[PDB]
Design a binder for this molecule. Structure first.
Ligand code: MN
Length: 210
């Protein structure tokens, strides 16, 4: 086995993955321009503090709700979801039946430089409802599931599933793929700048800082 036990788990992950395109590349370029405006605005220090999280090779921009055992920030700590995210992204996904109207109340933009990554994690199940929707921009990459980020020496273990995410791809995670296995972006899979908009609903009973 191994091949079979691994294909077996890959099938479980796949059962919780739905992908779509919908956006044309022209439509992507327009959204990408707005993402660049967010980056420029943040660089000028025009946002609330907790909206912007800067890391080596990766910035995160939190709108609607942000979090930091994870807890939501108090209300009013992060910026509102920009009108363009509603108009160009969320509304399109609603009209296409990907998510219900009124579902999304959190939008996070991750912006990666080449070599940037995000370590294996499960989107906090006490904070976020499912499904988790993401839309990718600027360049093609891949989302990996089940990788372990190891040390001595630094390495990433073999993925249970490697899922190509092309520019303009909509990725919807639910069930096993969202709850029972981690996902990550490996450094080797970010060769050019890539950004992604993650759209989520927070749970009514999500714990929140005072
Ligand atoms: Mn995630």
């Amino acid at each position: 086995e191994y091949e079979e036990r691994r294909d077996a788990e890959a099938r479980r992950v796949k059962s919780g993955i739905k992908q779509a395109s919908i956006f044309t590349l022209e439509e992507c370029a327009r959204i990408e321009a707005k993402i660049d405006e967010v980056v420029a605005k943040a660089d000028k220090g025009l946002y609330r503090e907790h909206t912007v999280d800067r890391a080596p090779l990766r910035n995160k921009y939190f709108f609607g709700e942000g979090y930091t055992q994870e807890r939501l920030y108090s209300k009013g700590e992060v910026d509102d979801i920009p009108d363009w995210v509603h108009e160009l992204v969320i509304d399109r996904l609603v009209t296409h039946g990907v998510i219900p109207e009124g579902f999304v109340n959190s939008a996070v933009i991750n912006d990666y430089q080449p070599g940037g990554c995000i370590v294996s994690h499960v989107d906090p199940i006490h904070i976020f409802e499912r499904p988790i929707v993401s839309v990718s921009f600027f360049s093609d990459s891949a989302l990996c599931f089940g990788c372990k980020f190891l040390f001595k020496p630094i390495r990433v273990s073999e993925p249970v599933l490697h899922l190509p995410v092309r520019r303009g791809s909509v990725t919807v995670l639910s069930g096993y793929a969202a709850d029972d296995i981690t996902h990550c972006i490996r450094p080797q899979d970010i060769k050019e700048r890539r950004a992604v908009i993650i759209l989520r609903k927070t749970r009514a009973d999500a714990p929140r800082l005072d």
